[PDB]
Amino acid sequence: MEPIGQLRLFSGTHGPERDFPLYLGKNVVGRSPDCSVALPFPSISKQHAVIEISAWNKAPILQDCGSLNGTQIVKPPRVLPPGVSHRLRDQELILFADFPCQYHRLDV
């Protein structure tokens, strides 16, 4: 399967940027090295959030999985309540705990 999106974890205290590919289906974000998008940092929940992608040409849906430190949309600033679906927009900035990320749609 070719990736259809990217999650960019920006550079920070943890070192240079890390880029994670996003595929059709369930892409789990969490600390567990099993996760599709493994962010191995103590403040990230073991199962933190899920990005669900139904097709290359459909917006991903992000949901927080009841994480301890939350998932936020950076701009406009919002807290995502557990279990509520949010459609991701290309270039949208997301916080998983204190880790800023950016979602990019790929082509095609």
């Binding site: 403040s43 990230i44 301890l68």
Partner: peptide
């Protein structure tokens, strides 16, 4: 290990 809470 459980998740570390963020505080100050």
């Amino acid at each position: 290990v459980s998740t570390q809470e963020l505080y100050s």
